[model samples]
Target: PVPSRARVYTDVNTHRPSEYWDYESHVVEWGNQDDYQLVRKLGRGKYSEVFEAINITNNEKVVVKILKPVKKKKIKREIKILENLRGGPNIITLADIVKDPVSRTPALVFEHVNNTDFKQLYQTLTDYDIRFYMYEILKALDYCHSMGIMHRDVKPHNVMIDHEHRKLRLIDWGLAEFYHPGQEYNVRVASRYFKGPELLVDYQMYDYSLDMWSLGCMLASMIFRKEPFFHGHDNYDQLVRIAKVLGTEDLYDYIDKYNIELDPRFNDILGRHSRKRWERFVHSENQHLVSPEALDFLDKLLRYDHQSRLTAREAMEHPYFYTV
Candidate 1:
């Protein structure tokens, strides 16, 4: 099958020097681990342990992410991508890179964001607040895509928001990768519920638009008050959940357009479903969060066709953000 390319920034990496994209060969310039001391554990993921740490020299708070045993190439890829995207708007800043001499464990130092959990924070956000933060997130997504990078993981858990400062930062570059046209990426990327239709259908030639789908899922959850818009129990069921809302007809249209074959396993679980109107999800509880422009923007984003979905830059220009 012919590979599909991104609608925008398809040649971004092609124009850059080989040194920029050849992350596997990049050398690590490790910093001193003694400068930072762990305050407490923040969270843990499959690849690393996260902690709130203090930079002893300045007594400033920072996040120290300690990497577990993994291929050195994976670490380098993340470091290089972060280095490339350092100053981009709403993108988390990688302050320094350090490693322990004895244990050989590498720790990434990042600017600390006084964040409130999204589950708790979203409950208190006004309509204007949701608009402001979603716009901020799009800025980060656009900047990375422009640099030929795709954040494979884009979800509520990955977004840090500090309501007091109204600050939003897109963090966790571990699963992120540089976008090379026609490259077949691992379908086992993003969290299950936020996984794009392309991934669920085993289409590997995805691009930055993959993040747009996840962002759409996040936005849907925010406005609809559904924690996960597609509440799939597993990978296979995930597509079924999406098919139920987006409709099987569009799903078939998307797979056909991409020349992707749905797994035979789907025959048992995927029943025919009609598209559900976005307004159907609206009710008294979430009516205040809903708006015409918001629905329009979401419709543009949550499409089954990746190219049909609005680009991050285009989404930022949406009328939903005009008043924000």
Candidate 2:
């Protein structure tokens, strides 16, 4: 099958010099490790150990992400992407890059945000608050897409919110990659619950529209009072879960358009389902967060065809954000 390209920013990388997209050839400029002192462990992921640290030079707080052992090229990619998006709207600011002098373990230093955990924060957020922060997230998404980069991971965990100050920052560029039209990408990116239909169906020519699906998933959870709107047991189950809600008939149409072959395992688990309306999930607990515009905006994002999903810029113009 022929690879598909992004609807917007199709030629952004092609217009730039190779140096801009050539991440592996970039040299590392290590900072002084002693300049920061670790205060407390914040979290740990497959790639890194995070810590709340103090920048001794400035007497300010910072986050120290000590990357685990991995390909040197992967580390360079994250740094280059961060550098390219340094001052973009709502993008995380990378302050410094440091490494253990002897062990050579690398770490990235970032300006700290007084963030409240999303699980706790989402519970207290009003309808207006959700709209405000979701708009901020779209700003970050649009900025990066305009710069020819795709944030493969866009779940709530990667979004940091300083509620007291009404500030939002999109963090974690480890899974991000520069977009080149018609290029086949690894469908293995993004968290399971938030993965788009393209990834689940093994369509590798997806683009920025992938993130919009994740944003839709996030919004669905927030307004429906479901922690994860789509709950799947595993990778295969992920598609089944989505099909259950989006309807199996539409799924078949999408696969046929892309000429995709479903895994044999699906024959045993997959079943026909009628499309479920977004309003069906609304109830007394989440009624305050639901609205006609909200449902319309979501319908545009959670489509089976990646190209059919709204571009970040287009999503920003939706009536749902008219008040924001």
Candidate 3:
């Protein structure tokens, strides 16, 4: 899709009622984070622990996620990333910031959102809910794209939900970066599953399509609640899985310069979907890995060519969900 000269307004052009107008007109207390007390562990990953907390100050609920101690530069990046995501739903808001250089462990306080996210919801959601979720998910992504930021890692684990409103929030900007076209940050941040063809074929020329590809993977899982479009043990195995669905890297087209070997599983797939391939991970057992409507959305989101992937606005317009 081509860039539109049209403008999308995050804040309406005209004045609206001020919901939080403590100092001006009308301000309401939706809730507070300061009163929250950590209860127990909710989830864990390579770098952080998410816990449920009670807002003792306001008698509300929330979650507290703290980063594991690492490098000073890494700590700085985390701060910068969150700072950049000031007002967006795709990302959790930073309720508080502490400059604890002595501990080297920075923490971010966010809405409690329901204890549920994609992994569990995947096991028990209707197809319509899946569509609704992705619609909201990409709205957040589109916002990030507008800010010229690349959420290096875009996956199910990073998506959080508010059970009450059925809203979605993306977290974890640990790998996020300022995306400058034709740069090292773009190449190095994108790898394997989230990677687009250009990064694998040659990282230098790739752009925003990488995140769209990751969005494709998430949409696939949300729709069927099962199966990954790509499967692999390592980068090599991963490429092979991708090749099985999509064709092998376009290396053979410019054969002389590229000589990487694809796994045997990809031999036929690589030969077949050379122009553009669709991953068939569970096609044998889970044929409905995607409904036709879901596929339409995925195609736009997963435009492997990169140039064609659906932009956020286009994605919302796609008729993938029974509701949206």
Candidate 4:
């Protein structure tokens, strides 16, 4: 259920849902003029607006993501994630953070990334380019996994690119979490096409491998230009989508073996069910016409079993990136 406060729970002029962020005391200070000069509104998400800004300290270009009132947990979560992260090809640089009392919101300082993401760029790439770009994406994921970060949301919008160096950077930490070693847990966040099967069936408990599951679906979208697994309006349709693709014959045992649990028939999140038509459609498709190097890496990423999925480090070590 989407929790909200009735008195202040309406969409704003920017047309986004209500958001609550703490530590907003610095918002006015930086947003007013000192740190950045807001160029123009770049884009607006469900709860925020992005603006182009120039960092005064270094005189470098950056994008400032300003949000409405948000809870303290999310604020701290993002700060923690950015603090431990370092510079990398696929990782966007976090420049600074600000908040203030008047606006009662938080603003993130981030380096500017490509306006077009992998999903858009996929249409323009040759098979070799696909292989090359995927390698860079994996490099950053490997680093995140090494530090135990599971980006619950790994969709295309979250993946950024730099046209100059051809760098890929993953941004947004609202869904990112640091995993404690030896602990089994799961936090399911959803975007339609990129949602995974285990999220529907194995909802009880999972692991950092859940992020790998997202990677599989995203890689499918990248190489194939279509979502890989289930895209359900609700839980039931979502699981049925899973059943249609990989089949549900041994799904129970497959998940149980990994210590994950499900809802049995898995009641629909709202009201949706499996779609047989989607299965037939998938069967008719051919392939991405990529090199063996690309296929091998994508196959690892698209594994059904979490344990079977490729670790970020292993993906980084793949020869596709090293090949001349």
Candidate 5:
């Protein structure tokens, strides 16, 4: 057995009252699902079904996330985290908690953001626009991290960007968790492309830095025009995809430093891969988005060592956003 490597802010929850972290202790104040009239299907995931709906009582648009078949504890965890994070900068606000009285299935209502599809929306963004939104997302990340929470699922889809008003909101806290020093966490948290190296290598003691790795992936896709910068067919290959860009040597260094055991299967897919320069990703089409400042910011964030990656606050001060 190996010790989980802890990072800064690991003890952030130490001072917070147990009620904040203890989801099971909090009783869910269920709202009537009938009050929200479904306008249309917005999105769907393994955990929940999302809909664009209206609070019939007020005629206000809201995003309703209907929890799929899941344990009561998991549902409570999300509500607890959202409740704890209310009023944080750029973090999506939970409007109400509802459940189907018949099926007992739960739903979470969130403040609506008129977001354009990232695939289409990102294509329309200028380099400056990219910097603007990236900075905004950081505000949410920094706020959540400061509150002792880790948004385990950080990806483009989870970020709602209203390019019209230049608004960005980090949504989807279902996978989020509170930080506790030396606590082993479920490594199967984030999406494949955005997963941190700590997770791929079976390191469970990760912290807020995991979200930074995810944000790094999103930024890479925006600047490089790659929907998912690291496209892996499966979890095992996910690390290999990352190694291909960040280099296997650095990954080995990260694993050794953290006392992490590389899954034996990784040996087959993993090989010596020299780090690829961020400049090399630039081409005639995307050159407009590439810059020294942008490269420097991405380089620091996509590192194999989670501890070596920049924190959200540090990233906010990067030169890439200094002018934006």
Candidate 6:
């Protein structure tokens, strides 16, 4: 059977060239899996097992992400996107791609970041430090979006930070997709806590603006000291969690504008929620990080409308980062 037409956005004025977004056409030339030596396990995810590895030839430290069983097309898409953005600002560098000899498992080699976990590091940061790091992330976001890619998954775990060196890198392009006007994308792309409202409402035909919402969620967590910012137990509750803070009325306004037919389950779950002021979140513990400029910046990014959220480029110019 022919695949259904891939969803496309309606409002995209400009789109990335075909060559950039064309993943299926790119051939994968797998490097020798023996060239790298794994030292230790770093982390694991549903898609891949991550390791701190080393290049036996160059003696350089690297990361080895061995993908689990998945579609060949999805693996190629990730490799193609990484190869395209390798040298862009704050984008993680992809050094090589390899596959296991016997198991035929695919793996990616990337430059190692001496990253400290945000769970521990965010507690030690000053207000200015947060701005500095967030600015660096915007550089990555702006570069990717300009190149017509939407990083469907953007969250703390994917952001690598070397606080001592004040360096940051945006990693994990596995869920990334090319943005094209009038194209509707799968809503199941991003993680639950960081999912944008578009995904929750079953809104398709979204554009690069989706990343801005994820970025905004990260900012909200950083400022408020809430790891998730929006703690949703399930996908259905995720929208409700957002409404509780951003207001239910605007959510309706958003669905009405897009002619979105929300799932019937939402009728009972959704109720009128007044938009809460960002300042209300400021307490003694987080007071230092909460400033008038910071609240204004957060306000612009967390809107229910995907288009209403500040684009990465425009966000970089916001007054909150003036000092950074």
Give each model's whole-structure lDDT: 0.92, 0.92, 0.59, 0.60, 0.87, 0.86
How do the predictions measure up, each by TM-score? Answer: 0.98, 0.98, 0.73, 0.76, 0.95, 0.94
Q: Considering only N, C-alpha and C atoms within 3 Å, which residue pairs clash in candidate 3?
A: 21-26, 21-27, 35-55, 35-56, 35-57, 36-54, 36-55, 90-170, 246-277
Model 1 poorest 10 in a row by lDDT: 116-125
Worst 10 residues of 3 by lDDT: 20-29
Which regions of candidate 1 deviate over 4 angstroms?
Answer: none
lDDT of 3: 0.59
Q: Model 2, range 162-261, lDDT digits (tens) per residue?
A: 9988999999999999999978999999999999989987888999999999999999999888989999989899999998889999999998888988
Kindly indicate the candidate among 2 and 4 with the higher lDDT: 2
lDDT of 1 at 158: 90
Candidate 2 vs candidate 3: the lDDT winner is: 2
lDDT of 6: 0.86
Q: Which residue pairs clash within candidate 6?
A: 7-183, 7-184, 8-182, 8-183, 8-184, 9-182, 9-183, 184-205
lDDT of 5 by residue, 169-259 (tens): 8988889998887788999999999999888888887889999999999899889898899999999999889989889888877877877
Regions of model 2 farther than 4 Å from truth: none
Ranking by lDDT: 2, 1, 5, 6, 4, 3
TM-score of 4: 0.76
Task: Give the backbone clash total of model 2.
Answer: 0
Clashing pairs in 2: none
Candidate number of the best lDDT: 2
Candidate 2's error at 166, in angstroms? 0.6
Which lDDT tens digits does candidate 4 get at residues 160-256? 7665576777778777765543433454565655655556654434445666667767665555556544566665566665665555554655666
Misplaced by over 4 Å in model 4 are: 1-33, 56-58, 117-120, 182-186, 202-204, 227-229, 258-261, 264-288, 291-296, 319-324
Per-model tally of clashing residue pairs: 0, 0, 9, 20, 0, 8
Q: Predictions ranked by TM-score, top down?
A: 2, 1, 5, 6, 4, 3
